[PDB]
Amino acid sequence: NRKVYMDYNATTPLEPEVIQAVTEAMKEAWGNPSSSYVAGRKAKDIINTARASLAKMIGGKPQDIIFTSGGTESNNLVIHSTVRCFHEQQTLQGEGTRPHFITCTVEHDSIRLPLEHLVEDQVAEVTFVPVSKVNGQVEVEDILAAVRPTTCLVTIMLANNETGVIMPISEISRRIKALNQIRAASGLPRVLVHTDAAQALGKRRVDVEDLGVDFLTIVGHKFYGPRIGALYVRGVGKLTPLYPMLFGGGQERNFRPGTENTPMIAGLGKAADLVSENCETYEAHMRDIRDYLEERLEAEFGKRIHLNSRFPGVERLPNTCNFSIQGSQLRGYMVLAQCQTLLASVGAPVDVARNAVRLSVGRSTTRAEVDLIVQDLKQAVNQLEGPV
Amino acid sequence: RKVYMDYNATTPLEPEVIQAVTEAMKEAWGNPSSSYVAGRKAKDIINTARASLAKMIGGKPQDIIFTSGGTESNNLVIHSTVRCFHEQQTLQTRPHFITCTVEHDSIRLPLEHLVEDQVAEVTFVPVSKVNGQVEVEDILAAVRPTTCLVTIMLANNETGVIMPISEISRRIKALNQIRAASGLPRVLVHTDAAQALGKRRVDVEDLGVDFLTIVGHKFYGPRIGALYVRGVGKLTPLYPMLFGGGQERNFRPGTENTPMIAGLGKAADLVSENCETYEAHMRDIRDYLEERLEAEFGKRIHLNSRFPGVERLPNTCNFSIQGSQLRGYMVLAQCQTLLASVGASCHSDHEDRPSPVLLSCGIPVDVARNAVRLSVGRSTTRAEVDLIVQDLKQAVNQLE
Numbered sequence: 101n102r103k104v105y106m107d108y109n110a111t112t113p114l115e116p117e118v119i120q121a122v123t124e125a126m127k128e129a130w131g132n133p134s135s136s137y138v139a140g141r142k143a144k145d146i147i148n149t150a151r152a153s154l155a156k157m158i159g160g161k162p163q164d165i166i167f168t169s170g171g172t173e174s175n176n177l178v179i180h181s182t183v184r185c186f187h188e189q190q191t192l193q194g195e196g197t198r199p200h201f202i203t204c205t206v207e208h209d210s211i212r213l214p215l216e217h218l219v220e221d222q223v224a225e226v227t228f229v230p231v232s233k234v235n236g237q238v239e240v241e242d243i244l245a246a247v248r249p250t251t252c253l254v255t256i257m258l259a260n261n262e263t264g265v266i267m268p269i270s271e272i273s274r275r276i277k278a279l280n281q282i283r284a285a286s287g288l289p290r291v292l293v294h295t296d297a298a299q300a301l302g303k304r305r306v307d308v309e310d311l312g313v314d315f316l317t318i319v320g321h322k323f324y325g326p327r328i329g330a331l332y333v334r335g336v337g338k339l340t341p342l343y344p345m346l347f348g349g350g351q352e353r354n355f356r357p358g359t360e361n362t363p364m365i366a367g368l369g370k371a372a373d374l375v376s377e378n379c380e381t382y383e384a385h386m387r388d389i390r391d392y393l394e395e396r397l398e399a400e401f402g403k404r405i406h407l408n409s410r411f412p413g414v415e416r417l418p419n420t421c422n423f424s425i426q427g428s429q430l431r432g433y434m435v436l437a438q439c440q441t442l443l444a445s446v447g448a449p450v451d452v453a454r455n456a457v458r459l460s461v462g463r464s465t466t467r468a469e470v471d472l473i474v475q476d477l478k479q480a481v482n483q484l485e486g487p488v
Numbered sequence: 489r490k491v492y493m494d495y496n497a498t499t500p501l502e503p504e505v506i507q508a509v510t511e512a513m514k515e516a517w518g519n520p521s522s523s524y525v526a527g528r529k530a531k532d533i534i535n536t537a538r539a540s541l542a543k544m545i546g547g548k549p550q551d552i553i554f555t556s557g558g559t560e561s562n563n564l565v566i567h568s569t570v571r572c573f574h575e576q577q578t579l580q581t582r583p584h585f586i587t588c589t590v591e592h593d594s595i596r597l598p599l600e601h602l603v604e605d606q607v608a609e610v611t612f613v614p615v616s617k618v619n620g621q622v623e624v625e626d627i628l629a630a631v632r633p634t635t636c637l638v639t640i641m642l643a644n645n646e647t648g649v650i651m652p653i654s655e656i657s658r659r660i661k662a663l664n665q666i667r668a669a670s671g672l673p674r675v676l677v678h679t680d681a682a683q684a685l686g687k688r689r690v691d692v693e694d695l696g697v698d699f700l701t702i703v704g705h706k707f708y709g710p711r712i713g714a715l716y717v718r719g720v721g722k723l724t725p726l727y728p729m730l731f732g733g734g735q736e737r738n739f740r741p742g743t744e745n746t747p748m749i750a751g752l753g754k755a756a757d758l759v760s761e762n763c764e765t766y767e768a769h770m771r772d773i774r775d776y777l778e779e780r781l782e783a784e785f786g787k788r789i790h791l792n793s794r795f796p797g798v799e800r801l802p803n804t805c806n807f808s809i810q811g812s813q814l815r816g817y818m819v820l821a822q823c824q825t826l827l828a829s830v831g832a833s834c835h836s837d838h839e840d841r842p843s844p845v846l847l848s849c850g851i852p853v854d855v856a857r858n859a860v861r862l863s864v865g866r867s868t869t870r871a872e873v874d875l876i877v878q879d880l881k882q883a884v885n886q887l888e
């Protein structure tokens with residue numbers, strides 16, 4: 101009678117171990133993090149341990165991790181800091197010359213909107229680069245060609261939010277690194293690189309040395325953790341500048357003031373541990389379920405269905421299947437409205453985007469669950485488009 | 489057994505609050521706007537908690553915006569004010585702010601930042617060197633043609649003294665009609681009420697303010713907060729600092745932290761239900777504390793939170809014992825039982841400078857240098873009061 105959840109890329113339930121860490125921290129580490137009494141000291145140690153956990157998860161160092169209220173804050177912080185950094189570099193050499201940003205057309209709202217805002221306000225310029233109407237992967241050459249003397253930052257999501265396709269962050273980092281050497285010769289400042297890794301963590305190995313990026317966004321609720329987040333900044337305050345959006349009491353080394361939310365940090369820390377320990381096991385399970393699912397969808401729907409995440413040679417998240425079924429009555433929201441068991445979300449090439457549905461599986465998803473939603477999808481399609 | 493007397497720094501979570509959070513983590517984990525059970529439960533928790541917070545302060549649910557904490561809430565009002573001035577111009581010179589000299593770091597630092605960068609001008613009104621309260625006439629005399637916001641904490645967190653928020657609002661209301669005749673913008677009023685919630689009745693209609701900061705962890709709630717904005721979108725503007733997914737009507741985007749919000753809501757229900765009880769208890773215990781300190785130290789102790797006719801939070805006792813070896817951090821270093829603080833906790837790093845806040849209220853450096861802040865709570869007993877006074881007696885002796 102039960103529902104089958106396949107919307108893990110939108111949010112995830114909390115691992116039981118995460119829930120416990122949060123509950124315990126609330127109970128026992130309720131003190132102000134600076135203090136020397138027990139509850140305070142336990143909060144300090146928890147925060148310190150969680151910082152190390154997030155660093156390990158991404159192959160960075162504890163000091164490179166700044167805790168935030170969520171992915172949105174992390175994303176806005178990078179964008180904000182960049183504008184400030186540019187202004188600080190023009191006042192140090194000395195609406196007029198404005199910071200320039202390079203991003204892609206399919207970013208999350210918390211990257212696209214802050215950037216649209218800066219353009220509307222005439223505070224900055226932005227190039228939104230298109231994804232490949234084929235792979236739906238940005239092309240590295242479009243990013244390098246959009247660079248200007250005032251370009252400050254390239255922010256590109258690690259994976260396509262609708263389809264799961266992996267963007268080429270490594271190559272982008274390497275080729276920007278080479279360009280920075282020429283820029284530096286001409287007294288031009290370094291273009292930094294940020295990646296919103298929100299969808300990758302817990303699903304695919306994320307290593308900052310491998311990615312070569314300067315900033316990386318971490319989002320708790322995408323990996324069975326609580327609703328807070330963090331931001332990685334390569335050697336923050338030494339190798340990479342970070343200007344804060346908030347002002348106050350000194351916490352997070354004045355990069356992000358406000359009393360630390362110990363329980364949330366304890367949960368994010370545990371969530372991160374679990375990724376560090378089991379990423380490969382998660383990814384394998386996800387891949388088995390998503391592949392079995394795509395086998396069942398082609399068996400059932402045949403020529404009528406188009407798998408929008410799958411391309412030969414194109415790496416993608418292990419758990420994502422974005423598909424479209426041909427037919428004027430199979431618009432994505434209509435298909436989902438008619439399903440009685442499946443929980444998923446709309447997944448949106450033009451005619452195909454209107455009928456796109458994004459299925460995203462999780463750590464517990466089973467083939468038996470897959471069978472239930474293919475059957476569900478079968479009745480929904482019959483109701484709407486009818487037999488063909 | 490340690491005895492805790494640093495409730496103004498942070499409080500433990502009520503058991504009911506811890507439970508609201510745990511239940512929410514388990515059952516209300518979904519997206520608030522989705523129609524599946526885990527999502528619908530989250531939408532209900534959020535709506536209920538917004539109502540709880542509105543009831544706690546005498547306002548309406550739509551006037552409430554959830555935030556990551558007091559720091560975010562205070563920064564938000566200051567940022568939105570700069571923006572609003574800018575937008576009002578454009579549709580037609582730097583905005584001017586009025587605050588006082590003893591505000592929390594999250595009001596003082598964002599305002600200082602605005603001055604340093606030449607974005608705005610700010611008058612930091614000194615408080616009475618007598619009792620430590622900022623005075624209505626000094627705030628009103630500080631008004632300029634471009635003044636667009638007056639921000640003044642409800643209660644100072646180091647001494648507990650209550651600021652005349654009501655009168656300030658009344659007077660600015662009066663002034664705004666005169667300003668309107670000339671076309672000057674209206675002056676809005678915000679109060680950082682962090683220290684007042686759960687200790688004294690907070691009512692926005694009595695306070696007459698346009699904005700009010702709410703801080704979870706000062707009232708046995710979780711480490712998140714909120715911001716009251718009177719008739720937001722209709723009588724008061726709120727420009728966001730964050731851009732993204734549409735949450736909080738775009739005033740504050742980002743997936744809602746449902747468990748934290750459940751916790752916040754339960755803590756507010758307890759204030760609504762029991763505020764007068766917590767207040768009376770705090771006052772009984774604090775006044776008892778002051779009597780024992782006086783009976784044990786006589787003329788050697790100065791009660792820095794206590795003046796005649798000066799209203800103060802019911803749980804706070806800032807005191808100094810005269811003596812060259814009695815610097816506040818030294819006394820606390822020697823106490824074996826009592827956990828208190830020399831001033832505010834985000835200043836834990838420089839426990840050896842006299843309090844700048846105490847200084848600004850008119851306390852000698854000799855007296856402020858020795859100041860210790862005791863802030864009691866819902867559970868504090870007279871027995872515990874007796875234990876820490878002896879602990880202080882032995883601390884002062886080992887020292888002097």
Ligand SMILES: *Cc1c(COP(=O)(O)O)cnc(C)c1O
Pocket residue numbers: 349357358359557558559560562592594641645680682683703705706
């Ligand atoms: C506790 C407090 C705040 C908020 O501080 P956070 O560190 O963000 O919890 C703001 N103002 C006052 C007066 C406070 O006491």
Ligand SMILES: *Cc1c(COP(=O)(O)O)cnc(C)c1O
Pocket residue numbers: 109170171172173175208210257261296297298299319321322733741742743744
């Ligand atoms: C989930 C997500 C975010 C963060 O959104 P929040 O509501 O703040 O959690 C950012 N970027 C991507 C690619 C995401 O999937």
